[PDB]
Write a protein that binds this ligand. Structure first.
Ligand SMILES: *[C@@H]1O[C@H](CO)[C@@H](O[C@@H]2O[C@H](CO)[C@@H](O[C@@H]3O[C@H](CO[C@H]4O[C@H](CO)[C@@H](O)[C@H](O[C@H]5O[C@H](CO)[C@@H](O)[C@H](O)[C@@H]5O)[C@@H]4O)[C@@H](O)[C@H](O[C@H]4O[C@H](CO)[C@@H](O)[C@H](O)[C@@H]4O)[C@@H]3O)[C@H](O)[C@H]2NC(C)=O)[C@H](O)[C@H]1NC(C)=O
Ligand SMILES: *[C@@H]1O[C@H](CO)[C@@H](O[C@@H]2O[C@H](CO)[C@@H](O)[C@H](O)[C@H]2NC(C)=O)[C@H](O)[C@H]1NC(C)=O
Length: 417
């Protein structure tokens, strides 16, 4: 189903800086170096470029939700809204947001109110369930509880699916080269950090509910799972297992939906989620490094407006970029590229062997040096991949070939090409 190799030339692992660092500069005179990234995409949506479009929930058709005081917008619930009116506006929204018909960048839809699986609408999302029950109870006033539940569950899930599949399908009909997918899907729901037996595994019937979203995976042309690291992870040893299984679940549903090649691009932050606490180098490896080592197509680094608001914040990002983040980005991007070239003939991604569950794609500091060019050109890389570095890759990593290239080493084009 998917036929893209590396999303950008020489980039098995691509990075998108999704930060308003433009504000840091224009408002505060703080100049954050963003040259290490493949893509800079302002979440403030200042320009319309070839590499990323984002649709926030108020930008693509008529997305129904409840305000936090419970008032409906466009009907609150997909079964209480007009799909036909949504699709009309969606058609026009896509053409205005994405003027090039051959646009081939990320096309991220950000729908975070209700979830398509009835089971996942818990906590503050239980309003979608309560209101689903209310809607059938008003239409049929003399109806017992387990009967409004089952009718509510089917109406909701039926509607939620028509809306999400129809929007993705229309996006792809109009822009067939867009890497269309929803932010935050799949979710592994492995937030059980306080439990003795924490493995990071997606609980119980979570995977089973995700299998019921095969229709969603089929309609997707990239997957954008979130690997934001909750505040509670800070200073424990559970970050890597949490991330590992969230990335793995995105590959798992891709393979089961008959698209082993579906680009997976997790969303990450450089802070613990909801905080101004920068991720230690450590935690970068456990998140961006982890994603690359599973063969992620790249990562989207989302930086909240909360973190680029002030001069102080912006200046702490500038310095984090120089000391920690930027060298790390070049490190992981180059490790992935060099491995692809040395192991996979330049025609596949290196992916962990299962015998080496924690291996990462990084540069040996004995073979390479990453340094800032004086005055401040971009980071340079000096040195060379040693024969021992290459021997270590051969033991830790195998190949997942780009579509069209044959396993195991991606040396020859495949059969039906
Ligand atoms: C490319 O990117 C990766 C960035 O992740 C760089 O590799 C990382 O470098 C950092 C800092 O230099 C390392 O952090 C230190 O780790 C040690 C523990 O080291 C041992 O355990 C690791 C896994 O558990 C393992 O990977 C290590 O093996 C490598 O590292 C050494 C060099 O340190 C080298 O000799 C080997 O050949 C391997 O390459 C090793 O077995 C930890 O003790 C360190 O302590 C620091 O922090 C504590 C705070 O608690 C402080 O008390 C210490 O004194 C010290 O400051 C430190 O965290 C990290 O292990 C590396 N990660 C990996 C996966 O290699 C790499 O350098 C970059 N390359 C380029 C070209 O720049
Ligand atoms: C179903 O959708 C309708 C809109 O068609 C919702 O009705 C609106 O409700 C608000 C606040 O309760 C009123 O101010 C509007 O006048 C209503 N609009 C119209 C034109 O009817 C209704 O609340 C939704 N039902 C559920 C269960 O969410």
């Amino acid at each position: 189903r998917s036929f893209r190799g590396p999303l950008l030339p020489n980039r098995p692992f691509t990075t998108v800086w999704n930060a308003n660092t433009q504000w840091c500069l224009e408002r505060h005179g703080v100049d954050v170096d963003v040259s290490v990234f493949d893509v800079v995409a302002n979440p403030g949506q200042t320009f319309r470029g070839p590499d990323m479009t984002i649709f926030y929930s108020s930008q693509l058709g008529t997305y129904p939700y409840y305000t936090p005081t419970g008032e409906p917008v466009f009907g609150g619930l997909p079964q209480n809204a007009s799909l036909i009116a949504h699709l009309a506006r969606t058609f026009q929204d896509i053409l205005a947001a994405i003027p090039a018909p051959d646009f081939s960048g990320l096309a991220v839809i950000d729908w975070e109110a209700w979830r398509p699986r009835w089971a996942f609408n818990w906590d503050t999302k239980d309003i979608y369930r309560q209101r689903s029950r209310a809607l059938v109870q008003a239409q049929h006033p003399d109806w017992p509880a387990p009967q409004v539940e089952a009718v509510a569950q089917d109406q909701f899930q039926g509607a939620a699916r028509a809306w999400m599949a129809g929007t993705l399908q229309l996006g792809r009909a109009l822009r067939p080269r867009g890497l269309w997918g929803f932010y935050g899907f799949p979710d592994c729901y492995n937030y059980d950090f306080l439990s003795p037996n924490y493995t990071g595994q997606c609980p119980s019937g979570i995977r089973a509910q995700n299998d019921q979203l095969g229709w969603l995976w089929g309609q997707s042309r990239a997957l954008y799972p979130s690997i934001y690291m909750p505040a509670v992870l800070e200073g424990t040893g559970k970050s890597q297992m949490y991330v590992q299984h969230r990335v793995a679940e995105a590959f798992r549903v891709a393979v089961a939906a008959g698209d082993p090649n579906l680009p997976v691009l997790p969303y990450v932050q450089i802070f613990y989620d909801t905080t101004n606490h920068f991720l230690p180098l450590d935690e970068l490896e456990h998140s961006l490094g982890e994603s690359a080592a599973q063969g992620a197509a790249g990562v989207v680094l989302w930086v909240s407006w909360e973190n680029t608001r002030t001069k102080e914040s912006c200046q702490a990002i500038k310095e984090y970029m120089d000391t920690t983040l930027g060298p790390f980005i070049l490190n992981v991007t180059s490790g992935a590229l060099l491995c692809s070239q040395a192991l996979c003939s330049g025609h596949g991604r290196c992916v962990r062997r299962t015998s080496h569950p924690k291996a990462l794609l990084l540069l040996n500091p004995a073979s390479f040096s990453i340094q800032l060019t004086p005055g401040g050109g971009p980071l340079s890389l000096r040195g060379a991949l040693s024969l021992e570095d290459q021997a270590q890759m051969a033991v830790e990593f195998k190949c997942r070939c780009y579509p069209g290239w044959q396993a195991p080493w991606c040396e020859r084009k495949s059969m039906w090409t």
